[PDB]
Scaffold this motif. Structure first.
Motif, mmCIF file in Angstrom:
data_model
loop_
_atom_site.group_PDB
_atom_site.id
_atom_site.type_symbol
_atom_site.label_atom_id
_atom_site.label_comp_id
_atom_site.label_asym_id
_atom_site.label_seq_id
_atom_site.Cartn_x
_atom_site.Cartn_y
_atom_site.Cartn_z
ATOM 1 N N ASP A 23 0.878 -1.178 0.000
ATOM 2 C CA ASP A 23 0.000 0.000 0.000
ATOM 3 C C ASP A 23 0.910 1.222 0.000
ATOM 4 O O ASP A 23 1.753 1.383 0.886
ATOM 5 C CB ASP A 23 -0.973 0.053 1.194
ATOM 6 C CG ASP A 23 -1.928 1.242 1.102
ATOM 7 O OD1 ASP A 23 -2.948 1.168 0.401
ATOM 8 O OD2 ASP A 23 -1.656 2.283 1.685
ATOM 9 N N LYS A 24 0.758 2.072 -1.021
ATOM 10 C CA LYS A 24 1.669 3.208 -1.240
ATOM 11 C C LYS A 24 1.591 4.277 -0.115
ATOM 12 O O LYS A 24 2.600 4.777 0.338
ATOM 13 C CB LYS A 24 1.443 3.814 -2.629
ATOM 14 C CG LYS A 24 2.030 3.004 -3.766
ATOM 15 C CD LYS A 24 1.929 3.766 -5.087
ATOM 16 C CE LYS A 24 2.506 2.976 -6.251
ATOM 17 N NZ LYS A 24 1.780 1.720 -6.601
ATOM 18 N N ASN A 25 0.394 4.546 0.394
ATOM 19 C CA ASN A 25 0.215 5.439 1.549
ATOM 20 C C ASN A 25 0.939 4.993 2.804
ATOM 21 O O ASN A 25 1.672 5.779 3.423
ATOM 22 C CB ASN A 25 -1.262 5.568 1.909
ATOM 23 C CG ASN A 25 -2.068 6.085 0.772
ATOM 24 O OD1 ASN A 25 -2.436 5.335 -0.123
ATOM 25 N ND2 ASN A 25 -2.317 7.365 0.772
ATOM 26 N N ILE A 26 0.694 3.742 3.178
ATOM 27 C CA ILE A 26 1.369 3.127 4.322
ATOM 28 C C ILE A 26 2.847 3.281 4.067
ATOM 29 O O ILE A 26 3.573 3.726 4.955
ATOM 30 C CB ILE A 26 1.063 1.627 4.462
ATOM 31 C CG1 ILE A 26 -0.448 1.372 4.567
ATOM 32 C CG2 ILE A 26 1.776 1.037 5.679
ATOM 33 C CD1 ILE A 26 -1.138 2.154 5.661
ATOM 34 N N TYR A 28 4.562 5.492 2.249
ATOM 35 C CA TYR A 28 5.040 6.837 2.501
ATOM 36 C C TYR A 28 4.994 7.232 3.964
ATOM 37 O O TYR A 28 5.840 7.993 4.369
ATOM 38 C CB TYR A 28 4.372 7.901 1.611
ATOM 39 C CG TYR A 28 4.939 7.892 0.187
ATOM 40 C CD1 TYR A 28 6.174 8.453 -0.097
ATOM 41 C CD2 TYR A 28 4.265 7.282 -0.853
ATOM 42 C CE1 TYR A 28 6.710 8.432 -1.388
ATOM 43 C CE2 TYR A 28 4.802 7.249 -2.146
ATOM 44 C CZ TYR A 28 6.010 7.827 -2.410
ATOM 45 O OH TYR A 28 6.529 7.794 -3.696
ATOM 46 N N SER A 29 4.015 6.740 4.743
ATOM 47 C CA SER A 29 3.994 6.933 6.221
ATOM 48 C C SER A 29 5.099 6.178 6.967
ATOM 49 O O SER A 29 5.501 6.554 8.070
ATOM 50 C CB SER A 29 2.705 6.333 6.790
ATOM 51 O OG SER A 29 1.618 7.165 6.499
ATOM 52 N N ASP A 30 5.516 5.037 6.440
ATOM 53 C CA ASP A 30 6.343 4.177 7.258
ATOM 54 C C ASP A 30 7.615 4.832 7.789
ATOM 55 O O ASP A 30 8.256 5.644 7.134
ATOM 56 C CB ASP A 30 6.747 2.921 6.509
ATOM 57 C CG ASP A 30 5.682 1.891 6.472
ATOM 58 O OD1 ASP A 30 4.959 1.792 7.472
ATOM 59 O OD2 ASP A 30 5.646 1.123 5.469
#
Length: 101
Positions: A23-26, A28-30
Motif C-alpha cells: 500500500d503506497k500510503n502506508i 510513505y507513512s512508514d
C-alpha cells in the motif's frame, strides 16, 4: 532475466526489507518501527545484505514491491517502490548515502 534487484553494498551488516503488493500510503507513512512490526507478515521479507554485490529475483507475477534499507545509522533515501519488470540497481556508498542508479 535482466530484471530484478541488484544492490552494491559498502556498509557491512546492512539489511533490507521487501514487501510485495505494498500500500503506497502506508509506504510513505512508514518509519523504521512501523515496517519492523510487519516483519512477520506473509508478504514481508527481511534479508541481510552481504558486502559487495547482491542480486535478488523479483516475482514477475507481482508488479510492485516496497524496498526498505536498514543501515546498522540513518540515510535520507532509505525507501523505494520498485517494479519487477525493471532492473533495479542501488549502491549503498561508504558515506551511507544510497544511490539508485
Amino acid at each position: 532475466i535482466m530484471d530484478g534487484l541488484y544492490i552494491n553494498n559498502n556498509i557491512p551488516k546492512t539489511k533490507i526489507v521487501l514487501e510485495s503488493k505494498p500500500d503506497k500510503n502506508i509506504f510513505y507513512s512508514d518509519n523504521y518501527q512501523s515496517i519492523s512490526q510487519r516483519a512477520a507478515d506473509d508478504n514481508v521479507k527481511a534479508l541481510n545484505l552481504k558486502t559487495g554485490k547482491n542480486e535478488f529475483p523479483l516475482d514477475k507475477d507481482i508488479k510492485d514491491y516496497a524496498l526498505y534499507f536498514i543501515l546498522p545509522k540513518k540515510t535520507e533515501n532509505w525507501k523505494y517502490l520498485i517494479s519487477s519488470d525493471s532492473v533495479n540497481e542501488f549502491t549503498i556508498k561508504n558515506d551511507s548515502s544510497i544511490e539508485k542508479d
